[PDB]
Amino acid sequence: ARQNFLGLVVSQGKMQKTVKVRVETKVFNKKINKELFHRRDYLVHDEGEISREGDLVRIEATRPLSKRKFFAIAEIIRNKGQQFALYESEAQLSVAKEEAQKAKEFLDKRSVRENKTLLRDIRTIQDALSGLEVNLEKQRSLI
Amino acid sequence: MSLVKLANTCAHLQNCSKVRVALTSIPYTKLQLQFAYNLYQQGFLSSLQKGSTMGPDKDFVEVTPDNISTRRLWVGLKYRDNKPVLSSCKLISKPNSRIHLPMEDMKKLCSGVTIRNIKPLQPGELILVRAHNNIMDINEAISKKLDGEVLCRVK
Amino acid sequence: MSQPLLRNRSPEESELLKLKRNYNRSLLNFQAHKKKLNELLNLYHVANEFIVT
Amino acid sequence: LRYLKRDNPEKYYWTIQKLGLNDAAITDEFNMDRRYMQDYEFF
Amino acid sequence: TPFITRIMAELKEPLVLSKGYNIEEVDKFLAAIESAKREDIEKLEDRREAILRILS
Amino acid sequence: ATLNQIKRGSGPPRRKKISTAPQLDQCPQRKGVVLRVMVLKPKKPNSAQRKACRVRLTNGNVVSAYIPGEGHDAQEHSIVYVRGGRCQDLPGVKYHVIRGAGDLSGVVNRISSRSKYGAKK
RNA sequence: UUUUAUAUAUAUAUAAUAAGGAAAAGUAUUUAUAAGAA
RNA sequence: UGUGGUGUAAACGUGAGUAAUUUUAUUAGGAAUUAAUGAACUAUAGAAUAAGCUAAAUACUUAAUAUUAUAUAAAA
RNA sequence: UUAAGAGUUAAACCUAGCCAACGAUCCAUAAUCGAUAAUGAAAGUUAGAACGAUCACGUUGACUCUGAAAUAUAGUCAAUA
RNA sequence: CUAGAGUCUAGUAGUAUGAAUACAAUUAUUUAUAAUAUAUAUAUAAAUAAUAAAUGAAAAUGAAAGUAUUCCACCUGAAGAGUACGUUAGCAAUAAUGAAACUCAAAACAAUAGACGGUUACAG
RNA sequence: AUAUGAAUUAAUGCGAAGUUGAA
Ligand SMILES: [Mg+2]
Ligand SMILES: [Mg+2]
Ligand SMILES: [Mg+2]
Ligand SMILES: [Mg+2]
Ligand SMILES: [Mg+2]
Ligand SMILES: [Mg+2]
Ligand SMILES: [Mg+2]
Ligand SMILES: [Mg+2]
Ligand SMILES: [Mg+2]
Ligand SMILES: [Mg+2]
């Protein structure tokens, strides 16, 4: 059948409709007597641009598409590079909302302290006149 | 399943034999347990016991993640006629170079041929092969036509 | 060798163990809180003698 | 943070963004060679 | 980096106590001790001030 | 030393065989012309007056060749054939002139090991 | 060990008590083969 | 010794070039999913017409007669 | 253009890529291989004469016709003798 | 040695028993804790010294030069030679990388007995 | 650039019996 390999995307977007896929195979080295891996980087055709660095993909043989590109993306085994891209794009603003409300809370407590004397009040009333412990008691009670 | 842990166990048994200690301990993992059972069934080890780091267990204890860290397998060593029964123990498949043999080459090894620079089986020797996460004697592995990784050599 | 080596804990055991561990941690916090409060108490006790004016 | 990337991709980008770092800073090889200090005017 | 800014601002707030203390809790404990005796105002105020200066 | 170090190139030292007759360019013999005939003293302990010749070969190199046998009939511009082999007690004469070829005749009145010295019987 | 008994505050200290005994005669092919000397 | 048909893309010899940009070795490897190519035999059917130019023709020219792209469906 | 993919060749327009200390590019050397030959216990190492398989060339370089297939030991042009 | 400053600062440059993990019998001292009532000649650890087994060519090592695992660096007879050339940086100095031909059957290490020394003392 | 030769020139190897220093 058409040659099929399993690989990991390394470079994406440097090119137009082309990616680089690291492919690993097993070979017996008689000299050192070891079943060792060998690596090669394939220039592979990406059409639709559905590839991202760090994706596990299956690459399949095709007609010669350029001087050095004889394979095309067949299936995204795992889309972890796409996950990275989406999570970056989301995070850039997801953190931003929390930062904004944190700044609001910080300045609000600044103002609350700015309004702040009661030792005068407390003393005036005396002239006429632990929460974590309770949480511990709750935990002990349930245990 | 570390070949590193198994190698450490092999060296520990060798050292324990050389200084003539009756009872010692090894990590309580299924690879170690299967190894100890196969050595014991072949007469190399006197006995297997469950235990902790301090010593063998007095009463039965269930194995849970709570106590797994300190669990140990206590092996008793045999010394007969002022000699150690488990004289030597080696790893054929090093963590670097792992040797996975098909059944035909195991038969060749048992028949005296050197395959992948492995010195073939000797008369009083024992070779263990792991196939599909089960340890077994090489002879039984051939008997069941199971492809597997050759692990070790205890003589 | 065929049987599973260890019996994995049921989620009820997981919850109970969470309760025990949180009790230990919260008890340590409780001791530290007592100690800081007592130190503050002694500081305020003897703060008469100190000279800020 | 490299381990965090491997384990939790979402929390990793959340964290590097909160702490003020791009993925480039975490992923790449870094040392405070004095050329770094010249580049970023560290002193 | 906004997070670092807020964290390093909290240190330089006008009054934040050290060694795990905060103004609210010390206020509660001081007022509680003051109440305890029931069952000159200047001196107690400057005593409080000395305490707060110690823990700043 | 380690399997990766062995893989990366390290290994047992190559039991390398260098030629003891480099100027013969991997030929059993080479023809040559004798520029001069020279008498030399060997390295001690040995003492003697050993006969050697300077020979320009057909490949273009120049060599020093020991003339064996009791008597040499080689003068300057004689045609000789050169084989490998060094005069052990004389440094620099790495080659042996063949007796019975070119202008070198067989050893006169030689009767034992005749073949080595070009004699007839 | 286990089970109970007394006493004391479900638990603790003491005293006593222990089920593991079976017998029988007869029922080769071994494998590949690595030497040093001055 | 004139006009024509078939044969010299093989075999023979050599190892200069060639470190692979087209070379060698291997794969139960592929497609562009290779031509309305038979080169020279097999098994089948059919056809073999008219002029010109050659001195004449089984030499040459001119002409007659004899898969792919569309559109409709069907499936996988 | 080809029967046919492809910066293979020619034209046009875009992008900034590709290879590389697991050795690119450059230089030197070499026809390659086997169920062939030599050797070793074997892994291997050597040769590529002979037997066989593949490629290249037929004094040197380029191009053209024919053809299914040729830069043909053909044809044209040039170089050497 | 180079620049900037008034002798200083800023420099160029980069020379002159590998790491980790598992295990491994004693004794004697200490050392630091943990106890039990100065005594238990107290136990648990690490440091020191002599060992056992083990290793080694031996000297010697002896919880490592031992038993095993993993990663890296390095070595392949002496001399030529850390030389020449080239490159790399450096104003330069220097440094790094680093051969080849020729010559030889040598060369080296530990230990043994010796005579030798103004080598040590000591005696007769 | 790949080679082939070169006045001029650098280093080092050997050996002959020795000559000179005392590292
Ligand atoms: Mg031909
Ligand atoms: Mg015709
Ligand atoms: Mg050639
Ligand atoms: Mg060759
Ligand atoms: Mg050739
Ligand atoms: Mg041939
Ligand atoms: Mg021939
Ligand atoms: Mg040709
Ligand atoms: Mg010719
Ligand atoms: Mg030609």
PDB file of C-alpha atoms in Angstrom, chain F:
ATOM      1  CA  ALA F   1      33.597   2.880  26.359  1.00  0.00           C
ATOM      2  CA  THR F   2      29.845   3.442  26.589  1.00  0.00           C
ATOM      3  CA  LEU F   3      27.542   2.114  23.889  1.00  0.00           C
ATOM      4  CA  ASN F   4      26.881   5.632  22.608  1.00  0.00           C
ATOM      5  CA  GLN F   5      30.590   6.471  22.730  1.00  0.00           C
ATOM      6  CA  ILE F   6      31.269   3.268  20.792  1.00  0.00           C
ATOM      7  CA  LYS F   7      28.524   4.268  18.353  1.00  0.00           C
ATOM      8  CA  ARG F   8      29.842   7.817  18.002  1.00  0.00           C
ATOM      9  CA  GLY F   9      33.174   6.452  16.768  1.00  0.00           C
ATOM     10  CA  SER F  10      35.307   5.068  19.581  1.00  0.00           C
ATOM     11  CA  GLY F  11      36.515   1.496  19.299  1.00  0.00           C
ATOM     12  CA  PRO F  12      39.485  -0.869  19.385  1.00  0.00           C
ATOM     13  CA  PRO F  13      42.590   0.565  17.742  1.00  0.00           C
ATOM     14  CA  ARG F  14      42.782  -0.190  14.044  1.00  0.00           C
ATOM     15  CA  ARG F  15      45.439  -2.862  13.524  1.00  0.00           C
ATOM     16  CA  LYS F  16      46.622  -0.804  10.582  1.00  0.00           C
ATOM     17  CA  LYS F  17      49.080  -2.327   8.104  1.00  0.00           C
ATOM     18  CA  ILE F  18      51.443   0.183   6.506  1.00  0.00           C
ATOM     19  CA  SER F  19      53.640  -0.875   3.619  1.00  0.00           C
ATOM     20  CA  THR F  20      57.293  -1.629   4.307  1.00  0.00           C
ATOM     21  CA  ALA F  21      58.024  -0.689   0.665  1.00  0.00           C
ATOM     22  CA  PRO F  22      56.032   2.517   0.075  1.00  0.00           C
ATOM     23  CA  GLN F  23      57.990   3.582  -3.015  1.00  0.00           C
ATOM     24  CA  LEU F  24      57.106   0.335  -4.823  1.00  0.00           C
ATOM     25  CA  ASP F  25      53.478   1.657  -5.055  1.00  0.00           C
ATOM     26  CA  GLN F  26      52.004  -1.780  -4.262  1.00  0.00           C
ATOM     27  CA  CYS F  27      54.003  -3.532  -6.986  1.00  0.00           C
ATOM     28  CA  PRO F  28      56.053  -6.706  -6.344  1.00  0.00           C
ATOM     29  CA  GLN F  29      59.071  -5.124  -8.047  1.00  0.00           C
ATOM     30  CA  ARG F  30      60.017  -2.033  -9.992  1.00  0.00           C
ATOM     31  CA  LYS F  31      62.717  -1.371 -12.559  1.00  0.00           C
ATOM     32  CA  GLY F  32      65.270   1.315 -11.821  1.00  0.00           C
ATOM     33  CA  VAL F  33      68.507   2.987 -12.835  1.00  0.00           C
ATOM     34  CA  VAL F  34      71.493   3.202 -10.488  1.00  0.00           C
ATOM     35  CA  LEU F  35      72.641   6.796 -10.001  1.00  0.00           C
ATOM     36  CA  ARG F  36      75.535   5.889  -7.695  1.00  0.00           C
ATOM     37  CA  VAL F  37      76.940   2.930  -5.767  1.00  0.00           C
ATOM     38  CA  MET F  38      77.811   3.690  -2.158  1.00  0.00           C
ATOM     39  CA  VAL F  39      79.614   1.852   0.647  1.00  0.00           C
ATOM     40  CA  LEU F  40      78.138   2.380   4.107  1.00  0.00           C
ATOM     41  CA  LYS F  41      78.798   1.358   7.705  1.00  0.00           C
ATOM     42  CA  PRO F  42      75.935  -0.358   9.587  1.00  0.00           C
ATOM     43  CA  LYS F  43      74.647   0.651  12.992  1.00  0.00           C
ATOM     44  CA  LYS F  44      76.560  -0.962  15.825  1.00  0.00           C
ATOM     45  CA  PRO F  45      76.954  -3.573  17.320  1.00  0.00           C
ATOM     46  CA  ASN F  46      77.348  -4.710  13.704  1.00  0.00           C
ATOM     47  CA  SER F  47      80.487  -3.622  11.854  1.00  0.00           C
ATOM     48  CA  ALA F  48      81.007  -4.087   8.111  1.00  0.00           C
ATOM     49  CA  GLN F  49      81.362  -2.304   4.765  1.00  0.00           C
ATOM     50  CA  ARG F  50      77.946  -2.854   3.187  1.00  0.00           C
ATOM     51  CA  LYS F  51      77.293  -2.130  -0.483  1.00  0.00           C
ATOM     52  CA  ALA F  52      74.205  -0.088  -1.340  1.00  0.00           C
ATOM     53  CA  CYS F  53      73.057   1.868  -4.375  1.00  0.00           C
ATOM     54  CA  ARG F  54      70.887   4.894  -5.083  1.00  0.00           C
ATOM     55  CA  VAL F  55      68.184   3.910  -7.588  1.00  0.00           C
ATOM     56  CA  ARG F  56      65.690   6.050  -9.500  1.00  0.00           C
ATOM     57  CA  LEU F  57      62.643   3.883 -10.172  1.00  0.00           C
ATOM     58  CA  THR F  58      60.290   3.919 -13.153  1.00  0.00           C
ATOM     59  CA  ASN F  59      57.486   5.527 -11.138  1.00  0.00           C
ATOM     60  CA  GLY F  60      59.851   8.466 -10.522  1.00  0.00           C
ATOM     61  CA  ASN F  61      60.767   7.901  -6.879  1.00  0.00           C
ATOM     62  CA  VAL F  62      64.333   7.495  -5.626  1.00  0.00           C
ATOM     63  CA  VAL F  63      65.321   4.747  -3.189  1.00  0.00           C
ATOM     64  CA  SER F  64      68.327   3.173  -1.491  1.00  0.00           C
ATOM     65  CA  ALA F  65      68.786  -0.533  -2.211  1.00  0.00           C
ATOM     66  CA  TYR F  66      71.148  -3.050  -0.628  1.00  0.00           C
ATOM     67  CA  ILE F  67      73.116  -5.159  -3.120  1.00  0.00           C
ATOM     68  CA  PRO F  68      73.331  -8.687  -1.639  1.00  0.00           C
ATOM     69  CA  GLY F  69      75.774 -11.436  -2.477  1.00  0.00           C
ATOM     70  CA  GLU F  70      79.537 -11.828  -2.388  1.00  0.00           C
ATOM     71  CA  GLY F  71      80.215  -9.687  -5.465  1.00  0.00           C
ATOM     72  CA  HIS F  72      78.284  -6.855  -7.115  1.00  0.00           C
ATOM     73  CA  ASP F  73      78.663  -6.074 -10.822  1.00  0.00           C
ATOM     74  CA  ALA F  74      76.627  -2.854 -10.561  1.00  0.00           C
ATOM     75  CA  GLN F  75      78.094   0.488 -11.630  1.00  0.00           C
ATOM     76  CA  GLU F  76      76.511   3.883 -12.176  1.00  0.00           C
ATOM     77  CA  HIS F  77      73.676   3.940 -14.761  1.00  0.00           C
ATOM     78  CA  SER F  78      73.160   0.172 -14.494  1.00  0.00           C
ATOM     79  CA  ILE F  79      69.628  -1.169 -14.948  1.00  0.00           C
ATOM     80  CA  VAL F  80      68.342  -3.040 -11.892  1.00  0.00           C
ATOM     81  CA  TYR F  81      65.143  -4.480 -10.454  1.00  0.00           C
ATOM     82  CA  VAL F  82      64.132  -3.520  -6.916  1.00  0.00           C
ATOM     83  CA  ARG F  83      62.074  -5.560  -4.446  1.00  0.00           C
ATOM     84  CA  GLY F  84      61.033  -4.872  -0.884  1.00  0.00           C
ATOM     85  CA  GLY F  85      63.081  -5.667   2.188  1.00  0.00           C
ATOM     86  CA  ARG F  86      65.311  -3.511   4.384  1.00  0.00           C
ATOM     87  CA  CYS F  87      68.935  -3.955   5.375  1.00  0.00           C
ATOM     88  CA  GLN F  88      68.283  -4.413   9.075  1.00  0.00           C
ATOM     89  CA  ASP F  89      71.606  -3.125  10.418  1.00  0.00           C
ATOM     90  CA  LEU F  90      71.760  -0.129   8.055  1.00  0.00           C
ATOM     91  CA  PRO F  91      69.198   2.700   8.473  1.00  0.00           C
ATOM     92  CA  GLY F  92      67.604   4.001   5.285  1.00  0.00           C
ATOM     93  CA  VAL F  93      68.191   1.094   2.859  1.00  0.00           C
ATOM     94  CA  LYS F  94      64.618  -0.179   2.657  1.00  0.00           C
ATOM     95  CA  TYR F  95      64.930  -2.231  -0.553  1.00  0.00           C
ATOM     96  CA  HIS F  96      66.787  -5.185  -2.049  1.00  0.00           C
ATOM     97  CA  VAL F  97      68.311  -5.310  -5.514  1.00  0.00           C
ATOM     98  CA  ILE F  98      67.509  -8.548  -7.336  1.00  0.00           C
ATOM     99  CA  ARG F  99      70.500 -10.637  -8.406  1.00  0.00           C
ATOM    100  CA  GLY F 100      70.147 -12.202 -11.836  1.00  0.00           C
ATOM    101  CA  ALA F 101      68.167  -9.374 -13.459  1.00  0.00           C
ATOM    102  CA  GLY F 102      69.039  -6.249 -15.403  1.00  0.00           C
ATOM    103  CA  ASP F 103      72.753  -5.483 -15.196  1.00  0.00           C
ATOM    104  CA  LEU F 104      73.178  -7.383 -11.901  1.00  0.00           C
ATOM    105  CA  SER F 105      74.501 -10.894 -12.454  1.00  0.00           C
ATOM    106  CA  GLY F 106      74.158 -13.919 -10.229  1.00  0.00           C
ATOM    107  CA  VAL F 107      76.606 -14.370  -7.389  1.00  0.00           C
ATOM    108  CA  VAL F 108      79.752 -15.929  -8.813  1.00  0.00           C
ATOM    109  CA  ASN F 109      80.549 -19.480  -7.679  1.00  0.00           C
ATOM    110  CA  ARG F 110      77.308 -19.617  -5.683  1.00  0.00           C
ATOM    111  CA  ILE F 111      76.109 -23.169  -5.038  1.00  0.00           C
ATOM    112  CA  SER F 112      73.615 -22.955  -2.136  1.00  0.00           C
ATOM    113  CA  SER F 113      70.432 -20.887  -2.129  1.00  0.00           C
ATOM    114  CA  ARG F 114      71.198 -20.353  -5.804  1.00  0.00           C
ATOM    115  CA  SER F 115      67.713 -19.061  -6.598  1.00  0.00           C
ATOM    116  CA  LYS F 116      67.919 -16.218  -4.076  1.00  0.00           C
ATOM    117  CA  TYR F 117      71.202 -15.058  -5.645  1.00  0.00           C
ATOM    118  CA  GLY F 118      70.471 -15.643  -9.336  1.00  0.00           C
ATOM    119  CA  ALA F 119      72.872 -18.552  -9.819  1.00  0.00           C
ATOM    120  CA  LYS F 120      72.511 -21.298 -12.428  1.00  0.00           C
ATOM    121  CA  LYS F 121      72.822 -25.067 -12.248  1.00  0.00           C
TER     122      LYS F 121
END
